[PDB]
Amino acid sequence: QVQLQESGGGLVQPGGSLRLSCTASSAMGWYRQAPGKERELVARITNFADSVKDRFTISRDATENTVVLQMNSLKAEDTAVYYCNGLWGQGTQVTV
Amino acid sequence: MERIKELRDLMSQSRTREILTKTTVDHMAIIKKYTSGRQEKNPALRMKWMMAMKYPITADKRIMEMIPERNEQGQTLWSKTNDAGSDRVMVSPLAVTWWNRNGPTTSAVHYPKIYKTYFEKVERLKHGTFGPVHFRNQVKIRRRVDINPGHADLSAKEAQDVIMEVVFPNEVGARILTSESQLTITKEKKEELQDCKISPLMVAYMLERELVRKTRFLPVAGGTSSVYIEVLHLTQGTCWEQMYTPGGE
Amino acid sequence: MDVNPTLLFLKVPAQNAISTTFPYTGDPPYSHGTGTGYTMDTVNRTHQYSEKGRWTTNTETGAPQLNPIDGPLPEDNEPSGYAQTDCVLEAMAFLEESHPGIFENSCLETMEVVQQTRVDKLTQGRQTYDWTLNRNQPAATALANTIEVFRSNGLTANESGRLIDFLKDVMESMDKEEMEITTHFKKKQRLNKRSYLIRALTLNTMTKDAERGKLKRRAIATPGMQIRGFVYFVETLARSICEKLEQSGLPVGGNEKKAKLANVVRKMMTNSQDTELSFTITGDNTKWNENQNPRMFLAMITYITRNQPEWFRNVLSIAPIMFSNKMARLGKGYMFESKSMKLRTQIPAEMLASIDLKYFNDSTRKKIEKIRPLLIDGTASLSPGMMMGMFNMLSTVLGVSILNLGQKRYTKTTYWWDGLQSSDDFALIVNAPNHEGIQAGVDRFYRTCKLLGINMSKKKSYINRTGTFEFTSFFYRYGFVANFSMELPSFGVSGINESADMSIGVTVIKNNMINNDLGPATAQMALQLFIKDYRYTYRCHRGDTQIQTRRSFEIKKLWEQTRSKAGLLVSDGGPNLYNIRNLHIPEVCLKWELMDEDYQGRLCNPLNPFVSHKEIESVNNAVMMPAHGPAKNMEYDAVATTHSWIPKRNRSILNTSQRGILEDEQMYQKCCNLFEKFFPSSSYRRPVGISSMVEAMVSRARIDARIDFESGRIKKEEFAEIMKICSTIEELRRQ
Amino acid sequence: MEDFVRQCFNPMIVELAEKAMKEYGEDLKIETNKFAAICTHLEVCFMYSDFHFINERGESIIVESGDPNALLKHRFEIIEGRDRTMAWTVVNSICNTTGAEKPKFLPDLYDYKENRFIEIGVTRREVHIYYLEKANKIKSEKTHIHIFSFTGEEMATKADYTLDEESRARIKTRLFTIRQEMASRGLWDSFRQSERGEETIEERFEITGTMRRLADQSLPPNFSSLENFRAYVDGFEPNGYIEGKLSQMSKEVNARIEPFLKTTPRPLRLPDGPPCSQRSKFLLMDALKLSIEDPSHEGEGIPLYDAIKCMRTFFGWKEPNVVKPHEKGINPNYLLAWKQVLAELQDIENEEKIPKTKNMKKTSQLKWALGENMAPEKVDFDDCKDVSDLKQYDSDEPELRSLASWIQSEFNKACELTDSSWIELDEIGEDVAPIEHIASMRRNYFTAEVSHCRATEYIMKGVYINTALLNASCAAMDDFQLIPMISKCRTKEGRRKTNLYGFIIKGRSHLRNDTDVVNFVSMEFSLTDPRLEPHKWEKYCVLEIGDMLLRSAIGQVSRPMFLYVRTNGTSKIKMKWGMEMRRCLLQSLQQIESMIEAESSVKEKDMTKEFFENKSETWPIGESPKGVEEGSIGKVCRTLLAKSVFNSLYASPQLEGFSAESRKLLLIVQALRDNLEPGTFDLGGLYEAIEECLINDPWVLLNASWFNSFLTHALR
RNA sequence: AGUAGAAACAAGGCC
RNA sequence: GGCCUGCU
């Protein structure tokens, strides 16, 4: 019914910025799972985790069904696999 | 040869033989109009309704041996199922357009000579010269005027004998036309249409239209001439006059 | 702000924008089921408007008939059919005096026509009630069936080919003990004297559809074939009479009607001095046909035909004699529904005489109870008055007599009146020195009308000062004003064929521009819309478009094949070159010089299997029933092309017991085609004579083989073969 | 004398002569000598023609009996023995093939050698007078004439005798056989002179038998026979009989004129009852459009693919649920039908090429929604008579309903401008005359005025929907068919665009009569909540299907988006008339052009440009609580176009009746306003005639309210 | 149910 | 289930 394709992951330095996107073909959002930790909510569309407030901004275009996540002021603690949800994407690695 | 042969074939079967024997010549018309088909009360509604069907028109049986049953993609052009009360077969409208793109061709040079009235209208209009439009109230008064601009000063019956002698010289009967105007008209329209093969009936109808005078009552303002009345819709209006001079003058 | 178009009349006079008050852009009302209720209501209403007459029982038909003539004078303004014989005879006498020589002349031309008329003239008519099958059939079919039955019964005077002889046979049939008819389900059935009398005196009732301008539906009638010849002769006399009367407007067209109305109003007002006041009454007659007694028409015609040969008087009197005893078939019947058992049923009207009244509602129950006494053999006697305008012209004659009876020579008073009468409608201009004079004049006119069985509809009539009035949807306001809303329904595809529809549409636009003052820009818009609808109806689009249809492929290949694509007809997917200047030119001739010779030859090919021409009458004549008027025929200019095909027929006869009619049709058409090939003039001039088919055909075969050898293709071998084949068919006809 | 023709002559000739006898219509019993004389003439014609053959030479071959061969040519070919029509047929054919001259009378034979006619006549009198007699009867004749006479003599001009003399000996032997056989009979007391050329007849049309008795029962009450009545009529003369009965007639029979003043006319009463409902076949004021911005033209394209592409342009679909029920049907059926339509639309989207026309499955849902198998089965009366419930069809006056304010607002917004051009006109011949240029400029002005009008959009919607419905009914008579409501417009920027209002499911359409009804179910998207004017949607079922976000300065609205679903029906006549809605444009613009021409007849100049640009002149085209409001000519154009469109949409017998009976009163009121002393004979009757047309149709009730308002504003 | 409105449709008949 | 008709 929906298929979810993520993009924009990779390798970034401390204090840097990275932009994830999710193409979907109700609520949609981004979750992350770090090694040995449970899967946590990052942002959904808005609502935001306290760890990422003032640093990460989610937006949604309903025309193109696309949910961007702008991540600024990145830290080592933000190293995780990031998953889109609407149904789950495959997950995109983010390494700070 | 053929004609008497289908005559004999008809007389072979008892019913047609009886019809031919007991029916007198005078009743010809009656039995020819004898039909179960009622005259349509609302032609537009059914023409808009029938054209949505397949095989909505009718054509002679000969179409089955000039036009293929189907076109390139397989759209059927004609059907072999005959009409209700005739030997004609129901066919699709494509069989018309097909006939206009790959059907047999002929020499249509003589149609201008037959349809004299319409081509004369076209020639008269093609060489016409328009003028300025003047806006002023027009006092349209109703008058009896002749619409046909080619009438040869003959009535319906008066020219009917001429038409028969021109087209059907043998069925004239007693009448031999006395007026010499009719003599010259017969000579001209005989030598002109000597081998035209459109149809005797249409030739007679168009000769009747051309030669016979016809008159109708219309609201006119000025003009009053035969050539100026056919364009009465273009030269005279409610509050405007359009000066016009047909090509003839 | 709320939009309200009617307020537009506060600035534009009513007549200058009357077109807005004609909702002729929607579907007109239609009847759905039986017309029996309307027929019964009309019969009862006609019989109760003449209740005070005298009752009798016909010794021949055994039906009850009501004669109100010379009955008590009306004492109320309700409709009354109590016409007085002496008054109407005096009115006709004054009509003759004011127009000396009218009756004698008209009778002379009518006598000429009657004694030279032929039987085939009866075929030129629409549906007629065939009594051989008790149903409506085309005029030609009914005439043929009646002639066949007469010949089978021994009445063969019609073989003389004269309509007068056919009527002689018809009357002689009235005195026969037992006739025989044919029925298919073939069975030969015997009809006694009375049954045949009632079958010949009966009318078939139907419901009129496509009637705009009233909330309720009406019923109309169609007579048989025995009485149509007398009606034809009587109407010929009445037309010849009315053509000599300027106050009549029935035998003329619309523009002539307007011209005569303008002339009469100008004559009445202009001759009136400053002292005389003038008033116009826009009068409609309530229950016009129901209050006209056929006996009074008999009186009028016998006064008209005074001092004439007795045979002429008899033949012209036969018609009203039969109308006075006319019967009406109740109709199709009544359909019942049972929702508890979920079923429906259709009972024929002939059961109304005996069927119980438990199934009928209160209104229909009372109508049946009131009409039952008049039921004789499934049909109701309708002696008191005419059913539906069969004698239009005689009614117009009576109205014109009333109009002329106030020429100021018979009024004997300062007031006087004139006007124009067309059956069921009239305009009356009355002048008098004072309002009292006008009132007296109108009162006396109304009173005189009530003495002739004619009633004035007070609800649909009004009187104002002269200069503004109405007449048959023609609104006069110091000069007639165009409407254009009456002709709106005629702006679509007529439905004849492609070329015919194109020519008819352009010609209608042209005519409405000439007569109904259609504007130039409006005419161009009408042309554009008509072309759009024409292309969308016949699936013939411009060809350069990608509109996929059932005909878009062949059209597109023809388009790509043609070099000069401007010459293609709109029927074949070509551009439209029509304009205000080209509305009087056929499409073929307008595009003749632009067509490619190959396409031109393929289009206008005589050997095309689509074009079919039957008779000179049906070459380029199209019957378009105009809105708010009787069926009319139009001459349309068109060139015989491959697009002149004729459409498919009904084809539903195959499921009916009347299936053998199609075989007879086919055989008759085969014989007619053979005769035409033998006699080429068969179509243009209908052949005459008393010989039989095969005689003429074989003898002409003899002669034509002879002469076509004396110069032509034939050879001695073939000529002798034809001669001996003629002998063979001769001996075959022997046996 | 007839015994002679019984005895001697062969059958062939006697029946030929009998048919010639019938030809001119005289009877054989009165004078028979003519029969014998002309039958002998015919016999000599045969005996002279037969037994005479020719071959490729001249020099006729004479054989007593024609042998079997192709050589059976006849020397002389007979003229007489035929009807007049055929005799003249042979005459004309011979003249046209032989190039000879046409005689004015009937010849008897034709010959090849001399290529000409023979008129044989054997008279009782001697030849040398009868010859020149018939010669001076025939004008300037080259046809050779030859006659015999009983004495045995022969003669001819040119001294010419055209064949063998033994044949002529035959002729005269036959002749004297005739003569000295009458000798045994004895007929010459009249044989020489028995015919003198009598031609006279009187036409007899006698009334007798039953038809006479009928004539005796079709007279005035106090007459006994047609003879007596005709005698009375012939003896009747005018002696002032109309005056006597006029004086005797009661004076209550009058046509008194009631003056019509400003205070006379009363407002038309409107019926009272439940509010009026919606009758249109599609949403007019509450329609919503899903678009693609494609470059295709109106007819260009394929419906299903365009509809699917337009619907995919919208996001926010929700599971549908009931919002406002039909109140008389089964709303779950409508819900299931909507979901079925969506599912099958996806099914088409999946496969290879979108079909031009799709058929849907006949589930119970649409079986109920389309009214299938609900017509009562037709049976015979003799089998259903004891059923108590069996009665007539319900035939009574329709239910009474009072006017509501929704139709007024619908008409108000039907005359408003739009952001699109809803008319793409066809091509016309290039204008050549100045009048054609004026017409084209006028037409361009009106098109600019009316194209951006909701009335034109309604016209296109109705035309397309009815055309598709009629074509589907005529093609797919049996099987339910899906048709997306499509209308193509052009934006202000000029980009073409498509619009999808919804879908129509056509059902079984075996339409025989013009009144037979085809039922369909219509679904249309909208944003208008049906909870505010429920009485206008009595026959609709409205679901909630999604949410729409249209850009607005108030954040973004995120309005609900509902689906109006209903079961409707039409007929062949209704479809045909709804597919000719474009003539509303005509009606309206003809009215406006008549206005323009009438005003321009005053000032000798075309007045269109200043009317459409300056907008100085205005007409009363509506009333506001402040008073009557006037608008420019363009607003009048749009108002008249909307009036015509609504006439075509809400057409009914009520509309026709009210229009006629209110045009009458409008003419009376106009006469009053013109100071023409109008008068009426029965105004109450006219009022009752008008008021009986107002029953339940919203359009006619709105027209009546408009008429009442016009009366109130008029008469001042 | 629906269309429609003084009576009808919501297929007909034939096997 | 198979076939016929759509103004008769």
Residue numbers in the entry:
A (entry chain F): 1 to 25, 32 to 51, 57 to 97, 109 to 118
B (entry chain C): 1 to 249
C (entry chain B): 1 to 185, 207 to 756
D (entry chain A): 1 to 716
Structure paper excerpt:
Central to the replication cycle of influenza viruses is the viral RNA-dependent RNA polymerase which transcribes and replicates the viral RNA genome. The influenza virus RNA-dependent RNA polymerase is a heterotrimeric multifunctional machine composed of polymerase basic 1 (PB1), polymerase basic 2 (PB2) and polymerase acidic (PA) subunits, that catalyzes both primer-independent replication (vRNA to complementary RNA (cRNA) and cRNA to vRNA synthesis) and primer-dependent transcription (vRNA to mRNA synthesis) in the nucleus of infected cells. PB1 houses the polymerase active site, whereas PB2 and PA contain, respectively, cap-binding and endonuclease domains required for transcription initiation by cap-snatching. High-resolution structures of the complete viral polymerase from a number of human, avian and bat influenza A viruses, as well as influenza B, C, and D viruses have been determined. These structures have revealed that the polymerase is a highly flexible macromolecule that can assume a variety of distinct conformations, enabling the polymerase to perform both transcription and replication that require different initiation and termination mechanisms.
Finally, Nb8206 binds uniquely to PA residues 309–321 and 555–558 (site 4d).
